[PDB]
């Protein structure tokens, strides 16, 4: 069927490159510094 045999490559690729940029920003700004925040908070308590 067409949905399991795409020829829709340009449509797909638009959605593809968008997803990568979305995840990249999302990790970089939101979730990754919040993990270094856990580490640092534990470590700053470790200091005192």
């Amino acid at each position: 069927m067409p949905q399991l045999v795409p020829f829709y490559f340009m449509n797909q690729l638009t959605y593809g490159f968008l997803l990568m940029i979305t995840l990249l920003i999302l990790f970089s700004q939101f979730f990754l510094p919040m993990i270094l925040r856990l580490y640092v908070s534990r470590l700053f308590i470790s200091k005192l």
Partner: protein
């Protein structure tokens, strides 16, 4: 004889010492390090904090949420096979 002896004027062992730095640190840093925190989220009827409560508690490490999440997707494409055909 002499009544002249050190303890009358002490005015620098009643001050100086290193643990003061640690002392003043933990009255300011640790009085707002609340005992239970600000009660961190794990449940609520937001329709997905309920999901967190049954499955994604930091206590749970059983295979049950993994299985639960998987089974939906099996039903999804199989039904969608019949939705497309």
């Amino acid at each position: 004889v002499s009544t002249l002896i050190p303890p009358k004027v002490v005015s620098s062992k009643n001050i100086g010492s290193a643990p003061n730095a640690k002392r003043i640190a933990n009255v300011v840093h640790f009085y707002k390090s609340l005992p239970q925190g600000p009660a961190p989220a794990i449940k609520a009827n937001t329709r997905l904090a309920r999901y967190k409560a049954k499955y994604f508690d930091g206590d749970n490490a059983s295979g049950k949420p993994l299985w639960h999440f998987a089974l939906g997707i099996i039903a999804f494409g199989y039904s969608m096979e019949y939705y497309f055909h």
